[PDB]
Design a protein around this ligand. Sequence first.
Ligand code: NAD
Ligand code: NAD
Ligand code: NAD
Ligand code: NAD
Ligand code: CL
Ligand code: CL
Ligand code: CL
Ligand code: CL
Ligand code: CL
Ligand code: CL
Ligand code: CL
Ligand code: CL
Ligand code: CL
Ligand code: CL
Ligand code: CL
Lengths: 333, 334, 337, 333
Amino acid sequence: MSKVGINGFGRIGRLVLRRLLEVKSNIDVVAINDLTSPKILAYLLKHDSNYGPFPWSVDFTEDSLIVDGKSIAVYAEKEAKNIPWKAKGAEIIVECTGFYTSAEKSQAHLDAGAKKVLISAPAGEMKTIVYNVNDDTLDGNDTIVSVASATTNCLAPMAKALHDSFGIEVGTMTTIAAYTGTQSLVDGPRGKDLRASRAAAENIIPHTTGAAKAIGLVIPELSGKLKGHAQRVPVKTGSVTELVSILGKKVTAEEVNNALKQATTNNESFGYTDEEIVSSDIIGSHFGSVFDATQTEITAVGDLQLVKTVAWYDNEYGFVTQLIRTLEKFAKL
Amino acid sequence: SMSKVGINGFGRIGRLVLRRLLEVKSNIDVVAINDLTSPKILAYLLKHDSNYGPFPWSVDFTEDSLIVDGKSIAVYAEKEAKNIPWKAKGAEIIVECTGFYTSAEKSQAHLDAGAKKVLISAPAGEMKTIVYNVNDDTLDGNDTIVSVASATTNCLAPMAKALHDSFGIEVGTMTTIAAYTGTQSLVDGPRGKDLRASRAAAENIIPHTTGAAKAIGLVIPELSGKLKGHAQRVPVKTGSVTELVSILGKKVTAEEVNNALKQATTNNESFGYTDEEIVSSDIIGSHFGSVFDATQTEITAVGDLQLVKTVAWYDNEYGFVTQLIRTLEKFAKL
Amino acid sequence: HMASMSKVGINGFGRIGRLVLRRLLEVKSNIDVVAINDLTSPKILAYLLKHDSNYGPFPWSVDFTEDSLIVDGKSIAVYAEKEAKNIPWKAKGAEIIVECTGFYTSAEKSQAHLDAGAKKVLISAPAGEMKTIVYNVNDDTLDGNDTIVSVASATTNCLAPMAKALHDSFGIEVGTMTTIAAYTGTQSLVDGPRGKDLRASRAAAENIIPHTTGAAKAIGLVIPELSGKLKGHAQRVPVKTGSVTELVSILGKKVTAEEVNNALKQATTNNESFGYTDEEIVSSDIIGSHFGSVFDATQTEITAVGDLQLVKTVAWYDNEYGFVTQLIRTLEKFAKL
Amino acid sequence: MSKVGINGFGRIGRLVLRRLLEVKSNIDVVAINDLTSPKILAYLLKHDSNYGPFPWSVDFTEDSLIVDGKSIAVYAEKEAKNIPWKAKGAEIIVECTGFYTSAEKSQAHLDAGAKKVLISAPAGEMKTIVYNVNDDTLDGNDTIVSVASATTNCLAPMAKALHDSFGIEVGTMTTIAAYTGTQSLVDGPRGKDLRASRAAAENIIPHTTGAAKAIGLVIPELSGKLKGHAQRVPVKTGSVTELVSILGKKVTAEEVNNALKQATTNNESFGYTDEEIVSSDIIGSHFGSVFDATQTEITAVGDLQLVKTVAWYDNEYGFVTQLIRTLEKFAKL
Ligand SMILES: NC(=O)c1ccc[n+]([C@@H]2O[C@H](COP(=O)([O-])OP(=O)(O)OC[C@H]3O[C@@H](n4cnc5c(N)ncnc54)[C@H](O)[C@@H]3O)[C@@H](O)[C@H]2O)c1
Ligand SMILES: NC(=O)c1ccc[n+]([C@@H]2O[C@H](COP(=O)([O-])OP(=O)(O)OC[C@H]3O[C@@H](n4cnc5c(N)ncnc54)[C@H](O)[C@@H]3O)[C@@H](O)[C@H]2O)c1
Ligand SMILES: NC(=O)c1ccc[n+]([C@@H]2O[C@H](COP(=O)([O-])OP(=O)(O)OC[C@H]3O[C@@H](n4cnc5c(N)ncnc54)[C@H](O)[C@@H]3O)[C@@H](O)[C@H]2O)c1
Ligand SMILES: NC(=O)c1ccc[n+]([C@@H]2O[C@H](COP(=O)([O-])OP(=O)(O)OC[C@H]3O[C@@H](n4cnc5c(N)ncnc54)[C@H](O)[C@@H]3O)[C@@H](O)[C@H]2O)c1
Ligand SMILES: [Cl-]
Ligand SMILES: [Cl-]
Ligand SMILES: [Cl-]
Ligand SMILES: [Cl-]
Ligand SMILES: [Cl-]
Ligand SMILES: [Cl-]
Ligand SMILES: [Cl-]
Ligand SMILES: [Cl-]
Ligand SMILES: [Cl-]
Ligand SMILES: [Cl-]
Ligand SMILES: [Cl-]
């Protein structure tokens, strides 16, 4: 299988390699570009605060990591057009920096000699894939594709199942989510977002997300029908997404749960639980989303009905399992 | 009028009841406390507070009392309310904060033990349940035992009242993203029969059932049975937020919803307004029961369908207590 | 070969009790857990066993009935007796009790399990002056006549291997210890009474909390030559698990940091209980450790003015799982004596 | 001199202003240099996650803050030598960025028109002041001074009291300390320090500190006699320092506690407690250091004795009170 380069060896970038080795993928990771020395990247890869020790050996040289006995080139080019992707033949770039989230920006990797780029974040109006929701839309002509956010990978499977079974007329989502590197440790400036400047592990922090707003890139029939936001909270990873919908049909909780159970069957992207789990129980999940039947709520007065559905997600590893599913298919095309 | 209070349960709420009475220089005096522990320990906890810092007045103790700002408070340690000697120091109104007497029948014990009225710091079934500046006009001179519901109820009710008066609420569901509390667990282990309550609270997002929405009809009778809800408990020590998703009886804009709220909060000592980009730690110490945040208002419309999301902050300890005390000061004078 | 004892009961299916079962299964021990006594329903114990905040999903299947757990297909009886003397351990023939409640920390208290039909008891905590074992430090003192034994605290299992190595190589004349340690269920979630100790009443995930420990004071039970030569305490802090112990010593010899690190390295060679690191690790890196203690050469410090010298040595420990590994090593040996 | 500028309006820089206003200082803060807009600085000054709402009014303009009705110029120069300090006549700079911690570096403020610099951090071999320990060494001719670290301000009054009473012959320190902005929110590169790269609110993290090694600048007789380090842990502010010493005389715990009690009497910088406090009770302290008699420990075998003494410190607000005490004195010489 294809050779891969990772741009941005951060939380997502590191976990991309972790998961590729875990599934014994035929993808060959040949190069990493970041901003730092191999010594520091080796340290971060070996020791992880959320997932514990790297399951394979890790060393470094002047200009590479040696991971499980295999060499991976390390570059330190702030501008992607300068990355020497041709030197080890990286053909598909997993773009994980947060700084090339558009077609025009990620073109820099094609200019630097890669064939294709898979962006680990929403990236505007480009093909945007949630594996096992719309990955059938990928074809052999696609060169730059997005996997949207972790929140999108949580929300889309639930929304798709509800829409297929009952119709969603309108809905709003809140995700109660783990804090991430976009936030701040101590109160201090963090770009232009005032809320992002506040100490993440000491606060409930409202936070804008486009997961609902841009859901039409993944599920066309739902364009413009959803809105939402996030409340970021002090858990290191592991998150939960609530959706409150008006559906096309009156339902019971059992009926909603059964429909979802059915959608999750033989679906390695979308899991089901009727156990009273909590966020730490999703840490390390191999699903993009886990529907939780225990939290389903129907509120009805006369002809009016509100349906609340909830799914968990490991915004780090869980999401990464989706990104890797997508990467495997994209590399085959 | 009545001017002497007894506190049953000198916990998070009990201690803050005393703090707040003193802060507002109430004419109501706490004359007795009933707990399970020694005055030495109660003194220690009153002086040193993890959420609110050092007590602003002097605190000392004897074998059977606290001495707060130089005034003597009796301390009893009776497992069973019916045995608390409330007449000894003349406690007329019991602020019942233990979680163990949340019914008319149960709290009757305080009256059997000599007090005249009981205000329960929690939901307590079908009795008069007051959210100050929503339905406190329902209290009369014949009431002896009343509830001030939960902190979540005090957050939800004012927001729900203002929306309902201006627009009508046809149906709604809430989720409160809430500070963990002493009903939860520090490390994973049994916590009665509730599975989720058994999990380490400072290391998890934990779904948690709450009756705030289900029982809203005690506070706002026209919303009776129209709302549902739950909580997600998260790792902050105090400071919480309630989101309500409603279908209203009129199409609206966010500007219009926020203006209606601004009007309802204006000169309203119980219900505040912000259009600043605040986070939970900025609500710690709030003197409101609920602070509407106009920055989080969202209207989702598709044709004739419309979902309105409104959001209010609450200091589930001190904020709520300010309400409890508003209610207490009025209840003392009927 | 005559059968060694192979059937275990766990009293207190708590943080430690659930990890005992976990580690026994993990290492494919020939010891079988046949019964558990706690104060709750199988339903709740099964939920807590399946879902762990610190170590994640249980790696084997878990189901339950009205009076048992079914774990990896094997039935384990569940009893609910608050008094140990009433536990019906004979029903499934539990021979060795792993006593993990915190309520029977003496020989007088734990011999109730013998009354209740067990043959031996291993206590997951200090339990007075009984035989107290830190594996790979003094487990050679265990013999066939020991009936009730302690493995001391997680802090003792961290401290002892370091103190043993230093004392063997250089001599410890006097020393004091501070452990910076994860919070535990003896502490409080919110500020409120917690028995008689004032500090234990404070919100554990929101404070640094000084905390008394006997690990140094009772070190003579494990290393007799240091009896009465050490004091110390803990500072409990807001991490869920994973802890570190610092020891400051006056030694019998002048040393360099390098000579200390090398002596410790040799003491950790061929030693499944005591590890060594020279990497810049932090506490989350010790979570799930299979050692009782990991000596961290990066934190060694020698302060020397003329003839006077103070030596600081630091070891990490996973107070939950790492300690549990030491308990299980001792249990396996106890069972075969 | 009564006109001050603040370089770096961070945790320390903002609390500098808060404390100045709280004590009604006659110091006039005329200018602030940062990198961010006044809008964002206003928001941060108004809402503090550790200390709650700012007690005075705060507005802004495109180039100023208006605090309690008074205008403060805001500049945005990333090089100190370009800061226009002469425009509003800022004479004393409180240097709070962490990037000018030497004489040669802070010289830039003087080239830029200031007359004195007070550095909020250790700054090498220059005049270094712990107030109520050695502020009587501050000289009319000093133009660049340091107030060392929060940890130095905790350690120094305790060490001085012990040393005057008993003699300290050698000693080592460990501070168990709240995390700060030099650490990381998520695992990721943080300069060259590997430990600084790890998620600060999810770990105990060993951290080097010069508080003991450079004690000689403050207490010259203890020069070269102390070493120490930190363990950084997940509390937002509020810290504790332990010192283990060999003293020149045999002592009891009562005797150590009495000597320290005396040292704290009528001492605005050094407090005493015999209550069973924990770290959150130090937050908002007006002392640089609070000796805790409850943790004193004497370990004795034959004629060998080790003495463990312990002091709390609000590494933010507490240290800042010391910085202000020193600034007030400095401004008047
Ligand atoms: N919860 C999550 O963490 C999560 C989930 C889904 C998607 N994402 C997305 O994945 C992307 C990265 O997220 P993350 O949490 O890993 O961030 P992170 O900060 O942990 O990692 C970013 C990495 O990129 C590096 N970097 C920054 N600029 C660079 C440049 N110009 N060239 C090369 N390297 C550069 C940094 O050194 C860092 O190592 C973002 O687009 C984010 O939205 C994150
Ligand atoms: N913490 C919050 O956010 C919050 C908000 C609103 C309402 N409440 C309600 O107020 C009440 C107390 O809550 P809290 O958080 O203060 O709890 P807490 O656990 O902090 O305090 C309860 C106190 O009562 C004592 N107690 C228990 N049983 C007793 C008895 N039989 N006699 C005397 N004392 C006894 C305990 O020793 C403790 O000091 C509950 O009904 C709760 O639902 C709590
Ligand atoms: N947590 C640690 O870091 C750690 C490390 C080493 C040793 N220990 C020790 O191990 C023991 C337990 O610690 P833990 O953290 O598991 O405590 P825990 O509170 O998690 O577990 C105790 C378990 O015992 C049960 N229990 C309590 N009283 C009982 C009784 N009378 N009969 C039956 N069951 C009862 C509880 O319901 C709970 O399930 C203690 O002695 C503790 O000192 C703890
Ligand atoms: N927080 C503590 O506990 C503490 C205690 C003792 C000493 N200190 C020291 O005080 C100093 C600052 O600490 P802090 O905790 O406030 O850090 P912080 O990161 O909160 O604040 C630094 C501020 O300086 C600004 N800044 C960065 N580079 C700049 C530049 N070149 N020009 C202008 N502004 C710039 C940042 O935007 C930020 O607003 C450091 O030297 C630190 O070691 C901190
Ligand atoms: Cl580029
Ligand atoms: Cl992100
Ligand atoms: Cl939206
Ligand atoms: Cl509660
Ligand atoms: Cl409900
Ligand atoms: Cl017994
Ligand atoms: Cl314990
Ligand atoms: Cl001791
Ligand atoms: Cl410069
Ligand atoms: Cl710092
Ligand atoms: Cl040093």
